[PDB]
């Protein structure tokens, strides 16, 4: 299956995060595609841009949501309808969870009631 990481970049989320981030992304994941996107149409590039790939998980990187955030629900919206799993990997707590929610769920979809 095909992997991608997206990022509120190269700036919103911070000035060195979203680098390791496609540093460390790309070195365990060198399948995936890493990118970042600033606004409404690089959001819409990246993602128009995954779902010719077919990107089947999409981990969005990003602050949290109020409105700086509104270019991770716009790529979101973009690949939730071309028929991948996109997530959310806030800077909070809920980390852990955003991330099992798709790059764990999904190794946890396509497995059997036995092994």
């Given at each position: 299956?095909?992997?991608?990481?997206?990022?509120?970049?190269?700036?919103?989320?911070?000035?060195?995060?979203?680098?390791?981030?496609?540093?460390?992304?790309?070195?365990?994941?060198?399948?995936?595609?890493?990118?970042?996107?600033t606004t409404k149409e690089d959001a819409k590039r990246v993602?128009?841009?995954?779902?010719?790939?077919?990107?089947?998980?999409?981990?969005?990187?990003?602050?949290?949501?109020?409105?700086?955030?509104?270019?991770?629900?716009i790529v979101k919206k973009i690949i939730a309808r071309a028929?991948?799993?996109?997530?959310?990997?806030?800077?909070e707590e809920e980390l852990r969870k955003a991330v099992a929610?798709?790059?764990?769920?999904?190794?946890?979809?396509?497995?059997?009631?036995?092994?």
């Open positions: 299956m095909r992997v991608i990481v997206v990022i509120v970049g190269p700036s919103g989320a911070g000035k060195t995060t979203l680098d390791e981030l496609a540093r460390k992304a790309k070195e365990e994941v060198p399948d995936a595609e890493i990118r970042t996107v993602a128009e841009e995954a779902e010719r790939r077919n990107a089947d998980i999409v981990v969005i990187v990003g602050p949290s949501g109020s409105g700086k955030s509104t270019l991770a629900k028929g991948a799993k996109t997530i959310e990997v806030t800077t929610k798709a790059r764990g769920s999904w190794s946890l979809e396509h497995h059997h009631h036995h092994h």
